[PDB]
Amino acid sequence: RYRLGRKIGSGSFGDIYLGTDIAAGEEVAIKLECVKTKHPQLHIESKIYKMMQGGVGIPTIRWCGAEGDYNVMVMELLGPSLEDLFNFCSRKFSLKTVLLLADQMISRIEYIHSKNFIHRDVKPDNFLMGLGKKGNLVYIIDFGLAKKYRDARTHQHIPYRENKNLTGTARYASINTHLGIEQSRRDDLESLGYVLMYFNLGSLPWQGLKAATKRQKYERISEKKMSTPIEVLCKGYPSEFATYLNFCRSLRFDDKPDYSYLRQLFRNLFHRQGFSYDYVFDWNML
Ligand SMILES: COc1ccc(OC)c(-c2cc(C(=O)Nc3cc(-c4[nH]c(SC)nc4-c4ccc(F)cc4)ccn3)n(C)c2)c1
């Protein structure tokens, strides 16, 4: 029911291709997993997507299961990632674009959390713009590293644990993630904070650290991140970004974040600039 096209990259635990849904006469994206793999995960991830279905900015998928030597998941085709568009904009976003993105991304993460999961890999590569009439909508992708943090019925939080391996990207990981603490809601939001300052700066001060082993690289990133005060990181930019990061760093393991407070930070800032309020991102202005 699908024709496989060219390879376009890799997800957390599989390979990504373009394809043709011949029944629908539509192009789709296809994720493949070797059926004879040590730790199968595509089916689990598909179940997570299905629990998220219908939410704003949640892609629609179809778990087709096993064809030949591969488990197959099919997703509606989406547009470029925020990293692609960041490079298209020469690696700098205007304050307007950063704040519009911030408002969408805080709420996207809140939705995931409302469905009892934490994402644990918040980074620009995992946010894709929609196509056509939804070209202004930011979608989130990739639940291969997501984890349930509370019981669906009782809302009982999972237990506090330590000595956990880093799951996700080192550049945007929270400080407590580097220290091996079990991730929770606070960590997704802290990662988002680093993503936003990354959009503001073009790079983070813990980028481009040289090391031999990967472990050494991650340790150097961790140390630089813990030795860079938030006020230094955010120097020369509106205080709201530092307030955001400090607020995230003050949350306890099982605290429910005040998402509306953070959105309101950035919205008040947004409303003091004298922008035109047409909803246009930087990449659609050049
Ligand atoms: C027509 O609009 C544009 C404009 C520019 C573009 O590239 C700069 C593109 C464009 C967009 C893609 C693309 O890959 N779209 C896409 C990717 C995924 C995707 N990306 C990743 S990580 C690199 N995993 C998945 C994926 C996840 C689950 C699944 F079942 C299938 C794919 C999902 C849906 N659409 N490609 C190859 C080109 C489209």
Side-chain angles (χ1 to χ4, degrees), residues 2-21 23-35 37 40-152 154-209 211-213 217-286:
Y2 300 102
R3 168 186 178 287
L4 195 74
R6 66 183 185 85
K7 179 176 176 185
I8 43 172
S10 300
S12 49
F13 295 105
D15 280 320
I16 313 302
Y17 298 75
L18 292 169
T20 305
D21 183 344
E26 281 183 52
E27 196 179 44
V28 294
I30 300 178
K31 187 172 197 185
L32 296 187
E33 171 182 78
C34 273
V35 65
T37 191
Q41 288 203 312
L42 191 60
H43 189 48
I44 293 166
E45 196 188 4
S46 82
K47 292 198 204 178
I48 300 179
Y49 274 109
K50 293 306 273 194
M51 283 176 284
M52 304 291 169
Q53 216 187 273
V56 175
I58 302 300
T60 312
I61 58 103
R62 308 89 175 185
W63 156 254
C64 304
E67 284 191 301
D69 311 346
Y70 294 101
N71 294 314
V72 183
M73 188 171 65
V74 179
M75 180 184 285
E76 64 173 301
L77 188 65
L78 295 170
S81 76
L82 292 184
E83 181 69 19
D84 294 330
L85 296 164
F86 193 54
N87 288 311
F88 181 70
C89 295
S90 295
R91 305 189 61 79
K92 180 48 190 274
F93 284 160
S94 69
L95 181 64
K96 181 175 177 178
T97 280
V98 173
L99 294 177
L100 299 184
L101 291 175
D103 195 75
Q104 283 201 46
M105 295 165 84
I106 294 170
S107 294
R108 203 73 65 252
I109 291 170
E110 180 177 7
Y111 176 81
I112 294 170
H113 294 171
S114 77
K115 294 301 198 212
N116 309 313
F117 281 82
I118 52 177
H119 187 276
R120 303 205 301 177
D121 197 20
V122 172
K123 62 183 178 182
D125 281 315
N126 282 337
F127 293 88
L128 273 50
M129 302 306 301
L131 295 176
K133 298 280 184 62
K134 296 182 171 169
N136 288 326
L137 190 63
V138 185
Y139 293 71
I140 190 165
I141 58 161
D142 208 318
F143 292 97
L145 299 171
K147 183 174 182 165
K148 180 174 291 188
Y149 76 94
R150 69 179 183 186
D151 180 84
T154 65
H155 282 187
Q156 176 65 46
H157 210 288
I158 55 169
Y160 187 101
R161 297 277 189 264
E162 288 175 4
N163 298 128
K164 296 296 179 179
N165 296 330
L166 185 148
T167 57
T169 195
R171 189 190 295 174
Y172 307 108
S174 70
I175 285 174
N176 276 329
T177 294
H178 285 289
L179 300 175
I181 310 303
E182 184 87 72
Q183 293 180 55
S184 65
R185 291 174 282 192
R186 59 187 183 168
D187 300 284
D188 284 346
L189 291 175
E190 184 176 331
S191 292
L192 178 58
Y194 299 140
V195 168
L196 297 176
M197 280 307 308
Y198 168 83
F199 290 154
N200 282 330
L201 291 163
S203 67
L204 292 165
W206 43 86
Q207 278 182 246
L209 303 178
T213 322
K217 184 185 175 67
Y218 295 176
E219 182 53 30
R220 292 198 63 202
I221 293 173
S222 181
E223 290 169 5
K224 183 64 171 179
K225 191 176 286 177
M226 292 184 290
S227 66
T228 302
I230 286 163
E231 288 66 29
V232 169
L233 173 69
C234 302
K235 177 59 205 162
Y237 291 90
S239 68
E240 279 80 0
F241 293 98
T243 305
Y244 179 100
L245 277 166
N246 281 322
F247 182 91
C248 292
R249 279 285 293 153
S250 73
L251 291 169
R252 325 282 167 70
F253 173 69
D254 55 29
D255 279 348
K256 180 182 179 181
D258 189 344
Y259 307 93
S260 286
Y261 168 72
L262 301 172
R263 278 188 291 264
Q264 193 64 10
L265 273 179
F266 289 135
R267 287 287 285 173
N268 293 345
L269 175 63
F270 182 82
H271 285 144
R272 298 195 304 271
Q273 304 307 306
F275 294 140
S276 58
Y277 297 132
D278 45 4
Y279 202 83
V280 182
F281 292 108
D282 289 344
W283 48 89
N284 291 322
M285 303 193 72
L286 44 68

PDB file of all heavy atoms in Angstrom, residues 35-60, unseen atoms left out:
ATOM      1  N   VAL A  35      13.000  -5.715  11.804  1.00  0.00           N
ATOM      2  CA  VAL A  35      12.157  -6.617  12.586  1.00  0.00           C
ATOM      3  C   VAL A  35      12.999  -7.493  13.505  1.00  0.00           C
ATOM      4  O   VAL A  35      12.554  -7.871  14.597  1.00  0.00           O
ATOM      5  CB  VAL A  35      11.279  -7.470  11.644  1.00  0.00           C
ATOM      6  CG1 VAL A  35      12.142  -8.405  10.799  1.00  0.00           C
ATOM      7  CG2 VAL A  35      10.276  -8.320  12.455  1.00  0.00           C
ATOM      8  N   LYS A  36      14.219  -7.819  13.093  1.00  0.00           N
ATOM      9  CA  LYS A  36      15.115  -8.655  13.894  1.00  0.00           C
ATOM     10  C   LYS A  36      16.059  -7.809  14.747  1.00  0.00           C
ATOM     11  O   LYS A  36      17.271  -8.021  14.743  1.00  0.00           O
ATOM     12  CB  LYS A  36      15.899  -9.605  12.989  1.00  0.00           C
ATOM     13  N   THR A  37      15.520  -6.833  15.477  1.00  0.00           N
ATOM     14  CA  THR A  37      16.337  -5.923  16.267  1.00  0.00           C
ATOM     15  C   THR A  37      16.310  -6.321  17.739  1.00  0.00           C
ATOM     16  O   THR A  37      15.356  -6.938  18.220  1.00  0.00           O
ATOM     17  CB  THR A  37      15.862  -4.475  16.106  1.00  0.00           C
ATOM     18  OG1 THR A  37      16.825  -3.588  16.688  1.00  0.00           O
ATOM     19  CG2 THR A  37      14.509  -4.254  16.774  1.00  0.00           C
ATOM     20  N   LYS A  38      17.374  -5.946  18.454  1.00  0.00           N
ATOM     21  CA  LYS A  38      17.518  -6.345  19.851  1.00  0.00           C
ATOM     22  C   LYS A  38      16.360  -5.826  20.698  1.00  0.00           C
ATOM     23  O   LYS A  38      15.664  -6.600  21.366  1.00  0.00           O
ATOM     24  CB  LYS A  38      18.854  -5.845  20.403  1.00  0.00           C
ATOM     25  N   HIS A  39      16.141  -4.509  20.685  1.00  0.00           N
ATOM     26  CA  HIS A  39      15.100  -3.868  21.487  1.00  0.00           C
ATOM     27  C   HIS A  39      14.097  -3.197  20.557  1.00  0.00           C
ATOM     28  O   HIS A  39      14.263  -2.021  20.198  1.00  0.00           O
ATOM     29  CB  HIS A  39      15.709  -2.852  22.452  1.00  0.00           C
ATOM     30  N   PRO A  40      13.041  -3.900  20.141  1.00  0.00           N
ATOM     31  CA  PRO A  40      12.036  -3.262  19.280  1.00  0.00           C
ATOM     32  C   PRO A  40      11.312  -2.135  20.004  1.00  0.00           C
ATOM     33  O   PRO A  40      10.971  -2.248  21.184  1.00  0.00           O
ATOM     34  CB  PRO A  40      11.085  -4.412  18.927  1.00  0.00           C
ATOM     35  CG  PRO A  40      11.299  -5.436  19.980  1.00  0.00           C
ATOM     36  CD  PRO A  40      12.719  -5.309  20.422  1.00  0.00           C
ATOM     37  N   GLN A  41      11.078  -1.038  19.281  1.00  0.00           N
ATOM     38  CA  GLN A  41      10.470   0.152  19.870  1.00  0.00           C
ATOM     39  C   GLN A  41       9.452   0.861  18.990  1.00  0.00           C
ATOM     40  O   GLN A  41       8.717   1.703  19.515  1.00  0.00           O
ATOM     41  CB  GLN A  41      11.543   1.163  20.297  1.00  0.00           C
ATOM     42  CG  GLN A  41      12.316   0.725  21.523  1.00  0.00           C
ATOM     43  CD  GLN A  41      12.952   1.888  22.251  1.00  0.00           C
ATOM     44  OE1 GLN A  41      13.595   2.740  21.643  1.00  0.00           O
ATOM     45  NE2 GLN A  41      12.731   1.956  23.558  1.00  0.00           N
ATOM     46  N   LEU A  42       9.380   0.581  17.688  1.00  0.00           N
ATOM     47  CA  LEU A  42       8.511   1.373  16.823  1.00  0.00           C
ATOM     48  C   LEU A  42       7.049   1.224  17.226  1.00  0.00           C
ATOM     49  O   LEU A  42       6.290   2.197  17.194  1.00  0.00           O
ATOM     50  CB  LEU A  42       8.708   0.969  15.362  1.00  0.00           C
ATOM     51  CG  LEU A  42       8.059   1.886  14.320  1.00  0.00           C
ATOM     52  CD1 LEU A  42       8.596   3.304  14.411  1.00  0.00           C
ATOM     53  CD2 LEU A  42       8.260   1.338  12.916  1.00  0.00           C
ATOM     54  N   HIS A  43       6.635   0.010  17.597  1.00  0.00           N
ATOM     55  CA  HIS A  43       5.252  -0.215  18.010  1.00  0.00           C
ATOM     56  C   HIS A  43       4.904   0.603  19.252  1.00  0.00           C
ATOM     57  O   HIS A  43       3.840   1.237  19.317  1.00  0.00           O
ATOM     58  CB  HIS A  43       5.039  -1.709  18.259  1.00  0.00           C
ATOM     59  CG  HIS A  43       3.611  -2.093  18.486  1.00  0.00           C
ATOM     60  ND1 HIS A  43       2.588  -1.673  17.664  1.00  0.00           N
ATOM     61  CD2 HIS A  43       3.041  -2.894  19.417  1.00  0.00           C
ATOM     62  CE1 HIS A  43       1.446  -2.177  18.095  1.00  0.00           C
ATOM     63  NE2 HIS A  43       1.693  -2.923  19.156  1.00  0.00           N
ATOM     64  N   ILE A  44       5.797   0.608  20.244  1.00  0.00           N
ATOM     65  CA  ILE A  44       5.586   1.403  21.452  1.00  0.00           C
ATOM     66  C   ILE A  44       5.419   2.875  21.092  1.00  0.00           C
ATOM     67  O   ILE A  44       4.451   3.536  21.502  1.00  0.00           O
ATOM     68  CB  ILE A  44       6.750   1.177  22.435  1.00  0.00           C
ATOM     69  CG1 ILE A  44       6.730  -0.269  22.946  1.00  0.00           C
ATOM     70  CG2 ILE A  44       6.695   2.163  23.599  1.00  0.00           C
ATOM     71  CD1 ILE A  44       7.994  -0.702  23.658  1.00  0.00           C
ATOM     72  N   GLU A  45       6.362   3.411  20.312  1.00  0.00           N
ATOM     73  CA  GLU A  45       6.272   4.808  19.906  1.00  0.00           C
ATOM     74  C   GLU A  45       4.955   5.081  19.194  1.00  0.00           C
ATOM     75  O   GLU A  45       4.306   6.103  19.446  1.00  0.00           O
ATOM     76  CB  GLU A  45       7.451   5.176  19.005  1.00  0.00           C
ATOM     77  CG  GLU A  45       7.643   6.677  18.847  1.00  0.00           C
ATOM     78  CD  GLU A  45       8.690   7.039  17.812  1.00  0.00           C
ATOM     79  OE1 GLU A  45       9.219   6.124  17.148  1.00  0.00           O
ATOM     80  OE2 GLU A  45       8.986   8.244  17.664  1.00  0.00           O
ATOM     81  N   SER A  46       4.534   4.172  18.313  1.00  0.00           N
ATOM     82  CA  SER A  46       3.270   4.366  17.615  1.00  0.00           C
ATOM     83  C   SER A  46       2.123   4.464  18.610  1.00  0.00           C
ATOM     84  O   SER A  46       1.215   5.285  18.441  1.00  0.00           O
ATOM     85  CB  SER A  46       3.027   3.231  16.619  1.00  0.00           C
ATOM     86  OG  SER A  46       2.482   2.090  17.253  1.00  0.00           O
ATOM     87  N   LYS A  47       2.167   3.660  19.676  1.00  0.00           N
ATOM     88  CA  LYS A  47       1.128   3.767  20.697  1.00  0.00           C
ATOM     89  C   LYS A  47       1.160   5.133  21.374  1.00  0.00           C
ATOM     90  O   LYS A  47       0.104   5.712  21.670  1.00  0.00           O
ATOM     91  CB  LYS A  47       1.288   2.657  21.737  1.00  0.00           C
ATOM     92  CG  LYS A  47       0.996   1.260  21.214  1.00  0.00           C
ATOM     93  CD  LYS A  47       0.755   0.301  22.368  1.00  0.00           C
ATOM     94  CE  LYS A  47       1.047  -1.142  21.985  1.00  0.00           C
ATOM     95  NZ  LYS A  47       0.862  -2.057  23.144  1.00  0.00           N
ATOM     96  N   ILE A  48       2.355   5.686  21.594  1.00  0.00           N
ATOM     97  CA  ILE A  48       2.428   7.019  22.188  1.00  0.00           C
ATOM     98  C   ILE A  48       1.822   8.054  21.246  1.00  0.00           C
ATOM     99  O   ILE A  48       1.006   8.886  21.660  1.00  0.00           O
ATOM    100  CB  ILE A  48       3.877   7.370  22.568  1.00  0.00           C
ATOM    101  CG1 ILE A  48       4.408   6.346  23.577  1.00  0.00           C
ATOM    102  CG2 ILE A  48       3.939   8.783  23.153  1.00  0.00           C
ATOM    103  CD1 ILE A  48       5.845   6.566  24.005  1.00  0.00           C
ATOM    104  N   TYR A  49       2.204   8.018  19.966  1.00  0.00           N
ATOM    105  CA  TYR A  49       1.582   8.916  18.996  1.00  0.00           C
ATOM    106  C   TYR A  49       0.065   8.803  19.043  1.00  0.00           C
ATOM    107  O   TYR A  49      -0.644   9.814  18.991  1.00  0.00           O
ATOM    108  CB  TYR A  49       2.070   8.606  17.579  1.00  0.00           C
ATOM    109  CG  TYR A  49       3.359   9.287  17.164  1.00  0.00           C
ATOM    110  CD1 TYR A  49       4.539   8.566  17.025  1.00  0.00           C
ATOM    111  CD2 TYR A  49       3.387  10.647  16.880  1.00  0.00           C
ATOM    112  CE1 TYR A  49       5.714   9.183  16.631  1.00  0.00           C
ATOM    113  CE2 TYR A  49       4.558  11.272  16.485  1.00  0.00           C
ATOM    114  CZ  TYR A  49       5.717  10.534  16.361  1.00  0.00           C
ATOM    115  OH  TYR A  49       6.886  11.146  15.968  1.00  0.00           O
ATOM    116  N   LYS A  50      -0.453   7.576  19.135  1.00  0.00           N
ATOM    117  CA  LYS A  50      -1.900   7.395  19.086  1.00  0.00           C
ATOM    118  C   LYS A  50      -2.570   7.976  20.327  1.00  0.00           C
ATOM    119  O   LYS A  50      -3.681   8.512  20.241  1.00  0.00           O
ATOM    120  CB  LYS A  50      -2.241   5.912  18.925  1.00  0.00           C
ATOM    121  CG  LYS A  50      -1.812   5.306  17.574  1.00  0.00           C
ATOM    122  CD  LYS A  50      -2.324   6.029  16.319  1.00  0.00           C
ATOM    123  CE  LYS A  50      -3.691   5.564  15.872  1.00  0.00           C
ATOM    124  NZ  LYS A  50      -3.951   6.050  14.485  1.00  0.00           N
ATOM    125  N   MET A  51      -1.917   7.890  21.490  1.00  0.00           N
ATOM    126  CA  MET A  51      -2.475   8.551  22.668  1.00  0.00           C
ATOM    127  C   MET A  51      -2.496  10.070  22.509  1.00  0.00           C
ATOM    128  O   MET A  51      -3.338  10.742  23.116  1.00  0.00           O
ATOM    129  CB  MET A  51      -1.712   8.151  23.934  1.00  0.00           C
ATOM    130  CG  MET A  51      -2.076   6.756  24.438  1.00  0.00           C
ATOM    131  SD  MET A  51      -1.132   6.173  25.866  1.00  0.00           S
ATOM    132  CE  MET A  51       0.433   5.750  25.113  1.00  0.00           C
ATOM    133  N   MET A  52      -1.590  10.627  21.704  1.00  0.00           N
ATOM    134  CA  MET A  52      -1.527  12.067  21.483  1.00  0.00           C
ATOM    135  C   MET A  52      -2.453  12.549  20.373  1.00  0.00           C
ATOM    136  O   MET A  52      -2.615  13.764  20.209  1.00  0.00           O
ATOM    137  CB  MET A  52      -0.096  12.493  21.123  1.00  0.00           C
ATOM    138  CG  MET A  52       0.974  12.112  22.133  1.00  0.00           C
ATOM    139  SD  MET A  52       0.847  13.033  23.673  1.00  0.00           S
ATOM    140  CE  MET A  52       2.006  12.128  24.697  1.00  0.00           C
ATOM    141  N   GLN A  53      -3.055  11.639  19.611  1.00  0.00           N
ATOM    142  CA  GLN A  53      -3.729  12.025  18.377  1.00  0.00           C
ATOM    143  C   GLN A  53      -4.813  13.060  18.646  1.00  0.00           C
ATOM    144  O   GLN A  53      -5.495  13.022  19.674  1.00  0.00           O
ATOM    145  CB  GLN A  53      -4.332  10.798  17.691  1.00  0.00           C
ATOM    146  CG  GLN A  53      -4.261  10.872  16.172  1.00  0.00           C
ATOM    147  CD  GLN A  53      -5.011   9.749  15.486  1.00  0.00           C
ATOM    148  OE1 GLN A  53      -4.465   8.670  15.258  1.00  0.00           O
ATOM    149  NE2 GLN A  53      -6.263  10.007  15.128  1.00  0.00           N
ATOM    150  N   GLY A  54      -4.963  13.998  17.710  1.00  0.00           N
ATOM    151  CA  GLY A  54      -5.965  15.034  17.798  1.00  0.00           C
ATOM    152  C   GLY A  54      -5.488  16.324  18.427  1.00  0.00           C
ATOM    153  O   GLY A  54      -6.142  17.358  18.258  1.00  0.00           O
ATOM    154  N   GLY A  55      -4.369  16.296  19.147  1.00  0.00           N
ATOM    155  CA  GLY A  55      -3.841  17.512  19.730  1.00  0.00           C
ATOM    156  C   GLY A  55      -3.287  18.455  18.680  1.00  0.00           C
ATOM    157  O   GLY A  55      -2.888  18.052  17.587  1.00  0.00           O
ATOM    158  N   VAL A  56      -3.270  19.744  19.026  1.00  0.00           N
ATOM    159  CA  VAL A  56      -2.690  20.745  18.140  1.00  0.00           C
ATOM    160  C   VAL A  56      -1.225  20.421  17.900  1.00  0.00           C
ATOM    161  O   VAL A  56      -0.458  20.180  18.840  1.00  0.00           O
ATOM    162  CB  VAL A  56      -2.862  22.150  18.738  1.00  0.00           C
ATOM    163  CG1 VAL A  56      -2.146  23.193  17.885  1.00  0.00           C
ATOM    164  CG2 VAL A  56      -4.341  22.491  18.865  1.00  0.00           C
ATOM    165  N   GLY A  57      -0.827  20.419  16.632  1.00  0.00           N
ATOM    166  CA  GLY A  57       0.561  20.187  16.295  1.00  0.00           C
ATOM    167  C   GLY A  57       1.057  18.787  16.565  1.00  0.00           C
ATOM    168  O   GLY A  57       2.267  18.589  16.697  1.00  0.00           O
ATOM    169  N   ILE A  58       0.165  17.809  16.661  1.00  0.00           N
ATOM    170  CA  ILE A  58       0.542  16.404  16.798  1.00  0.00           C
ATOM    171  C   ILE A  58       0.360  15.740  15.442  1.00  0.00           C
ATOM    172  O   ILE A  58      -0.764  15.732  14.916  1.00  0.00           O
ATOM    173  CB  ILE A  58      -0.296  15.694  17.873  1.00  0.00           C
ATOM    174  CG1 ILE A  58      -0.142  16.388  19.231  1.00  0.00           C
ATOM    175  CG2 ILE A  58       0.090  14.223  17.967  1.00  0.00           C
ATOM    176  CD1 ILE A  58       1.284  16.425  19.774  1.00  0.00           C
ATOM    177  N   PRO A  59       1.404  15.162  14.847  1.00  0.00           N
ATOM    178  CA  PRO A  59       1.232  14.498  13.549  1.00  0.00           C
ATOM    179  C   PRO A  59       0.373  13.248  13.649  1.00  0.00           C
ATOM    180  O   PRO A  59       0.271  12.611  14.701  1.00  0.00           O
ATOM    181  CB  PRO A  59       2.664  14.152  13.121  1.00  0.00           C
ATOM    182  CG  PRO A  59       3.493  14.251  14.336  1.00  0.00           C
ATOM    183  CD  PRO A  59       2.812  15.183  15.283  1.00  0.00           C
ATOM    184  N   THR A  60      -0.267  12.917  12.531  1.00  0.00           N
ATOM    185  CA  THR A  60      -1.066  11.706  12.406  1.00  0.00           C
ATOM    186  C   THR A  60      -0.218  10.594  11.800  1.00  0.00           C
ATOM    187  O   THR A  60       0.528  10.821  10.844  1.00  0.00           O
ATOM    188  CB  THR A  60      -2.290  11.967  11.525  1.00  0.00           C
ATOM    189  OG1 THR A  60      -2.937  13.174  11.948  1.00  0.00           O
ATOM    190  CG2 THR A  60      -3.276  10.814  11.609  1.00  0.00           C
TER     191      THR A  60
END
